[PDB]
Design a protein around this ligand. Structure first.
Ligand code: NAG
Ligand code: NAG
Length: 398
């Protein structure tokens, strides 16, 4: 859409680049909200309303073609990110789901490089990514997420998309969802926005999930028809890793009786281990709390290979068919090596209560506990804070 008059004021976030010899060194980065979360309205004289809702093409009368959509739909800058539940303080990023004015911004943001015009590209095969988190105010049904998508570095800045990454354009993931704009351009044919995605962190205070998602396409692919579906170009399900699903029920939760106690803040380490030819082979997650390393659990379920790490053998044995067919752990790693954009978000799920994260086989939450109508009785103001984002050499971030 056309950038409007209103100025965009991005929150600044200090992050770190780490090596064993040099330790962790500060770097200046900026934070940008998703393009379609900025105010999107019609050009002067066309009346009130936006340019389409999630899941659909843009409206045909303001957008009959890309060129008309590019002048008839306006995307305003956000001068005060706090009005969308997004604030920073030095090395910390606070995401608030619900505000006191009653809105539910549910923010999704990306990490911009120091120029503000290009996303920070992370290349993590053979390296590790680490962060500290406070998950106390995330009850059953909430999802705080921190992940990588293979978005274009400038947000696909182009003739009809002059805003680019400065405005948060170019979102994609492995779900191939239909959005009214893709790469900042009206999505006239209602295609889906597809790309490889590494779900580093999807969690609340009750459960923690990790999952790589492969696609057989490089970068953002605009799919049509069956390309967008389950047997198409991307792996919807991913290769999931959750202590509850592998029958280790005392690892993570609210209380001293769990090895990772979500009543207190903790550190989350994720290592992308490669073979001697440079291809990703294993994904290893462990935690640090109160100055002590907390090793990963090992699997404990009949029919699941004994492992403390994500790998092809584990993914295949747990039924992750599309993950294997669309590239497997090596394919995930090839996307990581090309370069990925960091996304952070906080959201709930009116349709299914986030059951795949923390109910049944996945956690301790009861049927209905995760509904939004019930979340607000437990915690009226859900939020998450991420602090000291840092990445680099194996063994150097913690
Ligand atoms: C920013 O962080 C410092 C602690 O490092 C804290 O003392 C201060 O209250 C924080 N600022 C805001 C606006 O919360
Ligand atoms: C789950 O773990 C318990 C031990 O805590 C064990 O008795 C049970 O057999 C395990 N279940 C499966 C399906 O392996």
């Amino acid at each position: 859409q056309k950038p409007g008059e209103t100025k965009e004021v991005h929150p600044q976030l200090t992050t770190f680049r780490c090596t064993k010899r040099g330790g962790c060194k500060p770097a200046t980065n900026f934070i940008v909200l998703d393009s379609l979360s900025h105010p999107i309205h019609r050009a002067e004289g066309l009346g009130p309303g936006g340019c389409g809702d999630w899941g659909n093409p843009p409206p045909k009368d303001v957008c009959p073609d890309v060129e008309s959509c590019a002048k008839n739909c306006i995307m305003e800058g956000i001068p005060d990110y706090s009005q969308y539940g997004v604030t920073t303080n030095g090395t910390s990023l606070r995401l608030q789901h619900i505000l006191p004015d009653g809105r539910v911004p549910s923010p999704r943001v990306y990490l911009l490089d120091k120029t503000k015009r290009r996303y920070e590209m992370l290349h993590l095969t053979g390296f590790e990514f680490t962060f500290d988190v406070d998950a106390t105010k995330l009850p059953c049904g909430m999802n705080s997420a921190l992940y990588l998508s293979e978005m274009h570095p400038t947000g696909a800045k182009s003739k009809y998309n002059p805003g680019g990454a400065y405005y948060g354009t170019g979102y994609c993931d492995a779900q191939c969802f239909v959005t009214p704009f893709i790469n900042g351009l009206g999505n006239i044919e209602g295609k889906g926005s597809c790309c490889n995605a590494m779900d580093i962190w999807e969690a609340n205070s009750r459960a923690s999930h990790v999952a790589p998602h492969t696609c057989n396409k490089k970068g953002l692919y605009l799919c049509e028809g069956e390309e967008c579906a389950f047997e198409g170009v991307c792996d919807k399900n991913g290769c999931g890793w959750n202590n509850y699903r592998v029958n280790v029920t005392d690892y993570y939760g609210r209380g001293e009786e769990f090895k990772v106690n979500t009543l207190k803040p903790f550190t989350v380490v994720t290592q992308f281990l490669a073979n001697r030819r440079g291809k990703l082979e294993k994904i290893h997650r462990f935690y640090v709390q109160d100055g002590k390393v907390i090793e990963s659990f090992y699997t404990n379920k009949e029919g699941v290979p004994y492992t403390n790490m994500i790998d092809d053998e584990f993914c295949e044995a747990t039924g992750s068919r599309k993950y294997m067919e669309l590239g497997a752990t090596q394919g995930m790693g090839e996307a990581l090596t090309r370069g990925m954009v960091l996304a952070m978000s906080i959201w709930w799920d009116q349709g299914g209560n986030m059951e795949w994260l923390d109910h049944g086989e996945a956690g301790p939450c009861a049927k209905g506990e995760g509904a939004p109508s019930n979340i607000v009785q437990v915690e009226p103001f859900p939020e998450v804070t991420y602090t000291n984002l840092r990445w680099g050499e194996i063994g150097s971030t913690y």
